[PDB]
Design a protein around this ligand. Sequence first.
Ligand SMILES: Nc1ncnc2c1ncn2[C@@H]1O[C@H](COP(=O)(O)OP(=O)(O)O)[C@@H](O)[C@H]1O
Ligand SMILES: Nc1ncnc2c1ncn2[C@@H]1O[C@H](COP(=O)(O)OP(=O)(O)O)[C@@H](O)[C@H]1O
Ligand SMILES: Nc1ncnc2c1ncn2[C@@H]1O[C@H](COP(=O)(O)OP(=O)(O)O)[C@@H](O)[C@H]1O
Ligand SMILES: [Mg+2]
Ligand SMILES: [Mg+2]
Ligand SMILES: [Mg+2]
Lengths: 503, 78, 503, 502, 78
Amino acid sequence: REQGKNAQRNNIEAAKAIADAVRTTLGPKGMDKMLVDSIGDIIISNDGATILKEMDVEHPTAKMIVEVSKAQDTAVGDGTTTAVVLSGELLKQAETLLDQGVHPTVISNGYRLAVNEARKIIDEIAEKSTDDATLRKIALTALSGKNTGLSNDFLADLVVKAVNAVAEVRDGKTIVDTANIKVDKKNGGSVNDTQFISGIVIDKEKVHSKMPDVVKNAKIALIDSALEIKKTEIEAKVQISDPSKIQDFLNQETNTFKQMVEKIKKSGANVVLCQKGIDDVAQHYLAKEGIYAVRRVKKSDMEKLAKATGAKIVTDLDDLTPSVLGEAETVEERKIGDDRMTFVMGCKNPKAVSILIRGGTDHVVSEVERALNDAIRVVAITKEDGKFLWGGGAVEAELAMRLAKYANSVGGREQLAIEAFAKALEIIPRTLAENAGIDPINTLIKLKADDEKGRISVGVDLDNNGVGDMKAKGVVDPLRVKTHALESAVEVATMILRIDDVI
Amino acid sequence: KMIVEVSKAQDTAVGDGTTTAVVLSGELLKQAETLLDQGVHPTVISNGYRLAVNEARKIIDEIAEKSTDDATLRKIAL
Amino acid sequence: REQGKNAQRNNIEAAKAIADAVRTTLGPKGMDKMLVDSIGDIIISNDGATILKEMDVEHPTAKMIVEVSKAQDTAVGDGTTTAVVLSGELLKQAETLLDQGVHPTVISNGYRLAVNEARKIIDEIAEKSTDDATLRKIALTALSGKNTGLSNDFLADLVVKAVNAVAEVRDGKTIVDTANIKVDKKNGGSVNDTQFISGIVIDKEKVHSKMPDVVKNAKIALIDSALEIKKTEIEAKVQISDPSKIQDFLNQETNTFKQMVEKIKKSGANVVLCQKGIDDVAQHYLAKEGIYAVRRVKKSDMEKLAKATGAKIVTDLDDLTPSVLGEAETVEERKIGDDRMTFVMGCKNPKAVSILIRGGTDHVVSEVERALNDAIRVVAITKEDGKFLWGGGAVEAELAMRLAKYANSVGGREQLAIEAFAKALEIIPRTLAENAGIDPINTLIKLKADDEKGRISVGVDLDNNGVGDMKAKGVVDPLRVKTHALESAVEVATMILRIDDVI
Amino acid sequence: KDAMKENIEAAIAISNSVRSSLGPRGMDKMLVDSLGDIVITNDGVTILKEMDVEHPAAKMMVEVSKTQDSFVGDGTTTAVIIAGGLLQQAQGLINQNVHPTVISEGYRMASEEAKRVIDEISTKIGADEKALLLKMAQTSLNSKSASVAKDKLAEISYEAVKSVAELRDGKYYVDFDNIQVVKKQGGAIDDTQLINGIIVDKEKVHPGMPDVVKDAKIALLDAPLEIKKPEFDTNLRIEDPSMIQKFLAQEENMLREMVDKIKSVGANVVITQKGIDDMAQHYLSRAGIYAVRRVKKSDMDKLAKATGASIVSTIDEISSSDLGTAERVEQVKVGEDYMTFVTGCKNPKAVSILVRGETEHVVDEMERSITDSLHVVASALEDGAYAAGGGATAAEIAFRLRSYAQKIGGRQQLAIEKFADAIEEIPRALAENAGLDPIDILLKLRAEHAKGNKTYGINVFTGEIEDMVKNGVIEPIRVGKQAIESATEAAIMILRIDDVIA
Amino acid sequence: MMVEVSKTQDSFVGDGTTTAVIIAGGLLQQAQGLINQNVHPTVISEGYRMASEEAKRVIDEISTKIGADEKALLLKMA
Ligand SMILES: Nc1ncnc2c1ncn2[C@@H]1O[C@H](COP(=O)(O)OP(=O)(O)O)[C@@H](O)[C@H]1O
Ligand SMILES: Nc1ncnc2c1ncn2[C@@H]1O[C@H](COP(=O)(O)OP(=O)(O)O)[C@@H](O)[C@H]1O
Ligand SMILES: Nc1ncnc2c1ncn2[C@@H]1O[C@H](COP(=O)(O)OP(=O)(O)O)[C@@H](O)[C@H]1O
Ligand SMILES: [Mg+2]
Ligand SMILES: [Mg+2]
Ligand SMILES: [Mg+2]
């Protein structure tokens, strides 16, 4: 148990630490971490949430900072590093106000004021635009400090395209259900070989060799149950008194599978995607019937497939009518890499696409996937929000400048508190610079002035080796991410600030 | 042990102020830790403190109040 | 193993110790002890028997002194502290006679003489009276050193009333079966909310929501068996050869419960109190029939209820005739505190009542219950005996004075022995005083003289800060308790006195 | 002597562990159990119910917390602070050979008088019910980290209770089983909202069920939808290979018929506490029935009250009279997850509050903080009166007890006065926690109250002793009476125990 | 330090060392209360100092010169 000062400074020290663990992954010139467990083993990533979910955090307070990365990730997709680094800085900056005598609460109130205020300035200075031109920009930037190769422009384009292909419009606004974009990956070396499939890809093979290698104009039946011999819920026993029956019983079994197949054929279905298993005799006849079957299909998939082809997931083959079959121009098995996979294309419903990721190693494909997800999520958000911000320290520098001014128009103690939040915001520019290997302080000094002269969009230009116009370079931060990062950070910073005794 | 050295010096050299010199050294080192984190180099910080102290060493001597009467000698004592 | 002197003095030392453990709980200005185990945990009480049953006594001899508290309690209800403290003092006083050379046996004979004698003086000086006026007095005093609040007068009254409501008269004498008084408790804060229910209260809810919230003019059926599907003692198996039967068998089950309910309705019973369980389907139909049912009713209760309402406990629902149903003007469920309880009022037999104890905390309700029990037991005894004694050291002071006189009219050695018993009796006055914080010795000195001048009723007046007239203050000790305390103490003191070698 | 000394200290220790959380400058606690579970909160009941106390006296002090929590809902930190006061004070009196019986009586008498005073200095809630209740809700939120949005949360707290509050004999009654409170992370605090209906954190049991049903006939089961195996040892004997399919069909029919029954009675939604067989799932789905499963019992009851449904545990007998009603049931994604919203309930006195917090541990406190408000505005509403907060009423009771002490004179008086000093603990804590000088504020506090300023408390923001009802810091009268009640009952118990053994 | 009291009281007067100790405990136990109410130990020390001064004055005031009863007065003291 720790009381007062001990507890607090200690808590701020904990948060600060966990926060630095990811600090170097920020921005373009970011680095990666290598986490190794006991069995699975090596995991190499640049993703904030990953490096932390996998990290073995022990200190309670540190566990709380980790919580924000997992939230940032699942709630907004991008920004996990930022929210962590920011929480570390708000807690750190507060430690000064604390030593001077300012009460944790008023500090918590300053951060409220400040964040609520910033939550307006950004929305004030946010830049609207929904054209593919910028959607592409959001993408390029979301893929920066990541090990994706030189293909980023290619990847950005895949993402913009996938988002646009699934973006629907309802009562006036555009919605993008990221769930309609199925991303997968396969070791085969390339990264450029990343295919954009206008359909649903299933990492599965057809169950039986003789089944059609491809099926055009397919009537797709999704099945909940396993095409196998079922047993009655009430224990049963078979008493054979006549030798003859021993065969008859063995036949019932066969005729059972024959009928299952018959029900299936009768519906018109020529493609059977089974969430569960398929018996070898069932397979014999499905093949004899010429139906393309796939067993043990992932429920996640069973669902996407249902949505993409318009089919109804049926359990009781007795309710397998033509009415519940899905549609796809082609259902074809094709060998992607060492693996054979089932391609379902021309789905009744077009708002369902895939991104089959390729790349080599393994360790490179997983991450490229992680990078492509951040990109997919933010491009999607931006598609909906139609607003964005000036990246690379720009937004922050501005917010900091304005907030330090708003500070003066506030009380004594709270001012001190909001000036603290203003500085905390400068942590991003400083970080991007530090990692790039440039001079934090001067970068900041220069960045302040340019933004002060009204140059909203001057960010940290690693290329120009200092400050520069993010407008030109096209570095844009999506709105929703900034805000959740800021709000998440303030809520968690406050939580920790009030803890005066940990037991 | 180094911060302790200043109290022993303050004491034997000037008599009063041992607490002050210690508390002050603690604060200058503490305040510097921020400038350090921002990227400022220890040396330039050391140069700022020079400038600053050399400057203060003038302001005080500028604003110092002369007087040798027992009236104030008594005040120094109290 | 310990022989002679060692054993004896050691034994007296043991008894003395266990005896002091409870000494401070004696009288009005008494204190409480807090015993804590390993799981259940904290138990805070003033009750002698409790503090000891729960106490972890190891020494054999000490275990024997503990035996008298458990006896005093179960046999006479009040006086557990007294009997312990007294046994400690008789063994202690004997240790002197022992050192002088007196033989354990003659000491044992002195105590006989003495106690047999005192057993007459008290019965000689006992004060007859059975009026509620004094029954109320017995009560007030039985609740003294206990943490019951300021409500004592209220509680005393409940007790007098409950005793009087169940006191029956037979061949001329009054009998009070304390078993007809059901005491219960429920955390709800109040102590004044302690209800006196002219009926039987059951800490149980009706088994099913749709059952009547209340039942007027109730025909109550008490059931020994569980309204559930029973299986034949000889293992059975059901062989279904036809699919159809699978349902038929499931129906037999339903129709089974329907009939159980039918038998119940046919009897006229509209309230079913089941000592065992009730199946959800049985519940369905009992509710459909509108019968108020309660399951898993405590056998203890099943019995009181049988007695109060005049019902016969039936097992075989085939012997559930109108002849064996009980009666109550009302059977109603009512929410007492957080808990819902079943109130059975207007029972065919009036000589059955309840005291639903309330009070808060939990630790306060348990003890208040313990206090109310001492009160119930002694008020009951007094109701039967119609005799009582002057409390607060009075009876003792008198007995001591007379016994020291009787001592002279006895032999050499035995005199010494009876003078010892006379002193041992003064242990009570001294104790009451000590606890009150007054001066033992002077109190005793003063108390002796006043009793000597014939003032039987001068006891230790904590208020007057010394001695005083217990007659006025109304402090009265019930007869039966004094005597069992004295007799119990002598028997056990003698037992220990003869032990010259413990192995 | 010692057992007591030790007990009193152990007790006072628990008190202090909670003292710093009292008021608007209150601090919070972090609690990490053995399993590594972290609870970062301000709620004293939680801080108490949570901590690992061993000393029996300490457990007894914690017993206080839960009880104060139980009856009223706000004021558990208050109760504890007073119990420590009383104990620390009795510690002094005990040194002067004042008998623990005297101290217990004195404490008892003072307590009685203290509740009287509160009734006296109280104030019936007039036509200002709205703003009065709002002011109450806020003061509650002021101590919690929810202050950030006390204005919105208070309106919600006020709105929610006002809705489920039945004004019977010109007197209100609030059944909380009509206020469903759910917490879902991934949204800011300000995002907390009031949903007319009962939200259940459960999504539809099968991909094929509809996302929305309008004018829903809610069938509530407390039984699982599965084939019923007899109670007797049952076995199927197949001697003819043909029977095998006949049996399997019969088993499917039984499930297909359960669904038929529920459907036949007009059920539109099937919310069950238990499980739904996979095949039965197909059927409901096919019938167009929106069905959720393994639902929380507590929730089951709330859906009942709301929709006027009846929890059927015997599907075979599910009658139309057993169906609940709601204007519409719909699956909605609340951030990450999918929730089922039963809106337009048959019974409009049922509502839900959806607490939003960006983080798990954040939304958890947010949920605790709101429950505190609900309990307040509710308790206030019911009681009908309120007392001035900020230590004003405490300072008041302290004032009046010093007089009564002089009346009921004697040793009793020493105990009665100590009780007064102890109540003064609140103003001291409140001041201390902010930074105000306790002894100075306490002295000024006494002055004003002496001069009959029954509502002068500590404005912890300005540091001035102003009018508490004016500045709006007020609390239900019920909070104050119990704290003093629970507090004195602990002090008396610990005070009679002169020995603690195993 | 408390024992330091004993020897000193013993040193100067000779009778009253148990008395001195008993009071030092009182004062300390009392300051313990005041300290809980955020009364600064400087205030308590001044107050204690002032009270003390006044206490000795009082003794001088309520004292009594030993008159011609020197013998029996002194005997009564012994
Ligand atoms: N090309 C770039 N030039 C300058 N800044 C960039 C560039 N790309 C990204 N950034 C900045 O790096 C920060 C985010 O770094 P990133 O590694 O993506 O972490 P996070 O998990 O927070 O998104 C943002 O301020 C972003 O604008
Ligand atoms: N109000 C009273 N005034 C004086 N003596 C009392 C009073 N009440 C009880 N006593 C005495 O205290 C003794 C019993 O104390 P108690 O705590 O009840 O222990 P026990 O278990 O032996 O009944 C008796 O002598 C009884 O008369
Ligand atoms: N705005 C305020 N100004 C001064 N005192 C306040 C204010 N708001 C609340 N208080 C006081 O703070 C105490 C409530 O603090 P809290 O931590 O919530 O304790 P509890 O658990 O007993 O409700 C109350 O005595 C209350 O009147
Ligand atoms: Mg990113
Ligand atoms: Mg008794
Ligand atoms: Mg509160």
